[PDB]
Amino acid sequence: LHKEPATLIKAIDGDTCKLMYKGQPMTFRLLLVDTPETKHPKKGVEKYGPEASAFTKKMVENAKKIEVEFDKGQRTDKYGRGLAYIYADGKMVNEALVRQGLAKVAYVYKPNNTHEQHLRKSEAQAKKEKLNIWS
Numbered sequence: 352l353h354k355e356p357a358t359l360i361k362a363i364d365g366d367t368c369k370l371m372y373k374g375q376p377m378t379f380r381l382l383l384v385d386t387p388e389t390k391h392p393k394k395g396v397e398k399y400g401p402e403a404s405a406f407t408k409k410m411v412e413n414a415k416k417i418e419v420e421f422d423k424g425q426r427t428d429k430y431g432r433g434l435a436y437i438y439a440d441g442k443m444v445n446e447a448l449v450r451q452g453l454a455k456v457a458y459v460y461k462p463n464n465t466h467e468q469h470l471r472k473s474e475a476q477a478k479k480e481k482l483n484i485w486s
């Protein structure tokens with residue numbers, strides 16, 4: 352996979368944000384993870400949702416560099432959202448959320464699952480440590 356620069360426009364929630372990619376605005380959605388809901392009514396404001404949002408917001412807004420890494424399959428979902436692994440100062444946001452027990456590994460559609468195993472290892476560690484979602 353290859354990383355590419357991007358610029359933060361606005362963090363929306365734990366796993367969705369607006370970035371400037373190729374001088375164009377885009378909403379992106381993290382690959383292989385699912386942070387709890389804070390918006391959609393027919394889902395409600397789930398526990399750890401506000402937490403996942405703040406963890407993410409803090410991480411991306413205080414970063415000097417943000418990079419996007421698309422996987423080997425399709426790059427956008429049905430809603431026109433960019434699908435990627437996002438790094439804040441070299442730290443993958445997707446993994447960080449999972450490691451903290453603030454997101455579960457979800458939506459694994461091959462071939463967009465190159466980092467699936469790394470992430471699952473991180474989730475297993477958070478489970479055994481009984482972190483947040485796992486407590």
Ligand SMILES: Cc1cn([C@H]2C[C@H](OP(=O)(O)O)[C@@H](COP(=O)(O)O)O2)c(=O)[nH]c1=O
Nearest residue numbers: 367380381382383384428429434458460463
């Ligand atoms: C992460 C991811 C989400 N999605 C879809 C699945 C879900 O569709 P439905 O909304 O139809 O269930 C939605 C989950 O995103 P989050 O709440 O942002 O929904 O986006 C993909 O299609 N591919 C992906 O790789």
Ligand SMILES: [Ca+2]
Nearest residue numbers: 366385386387
């Ligand atoms: Ca979500």
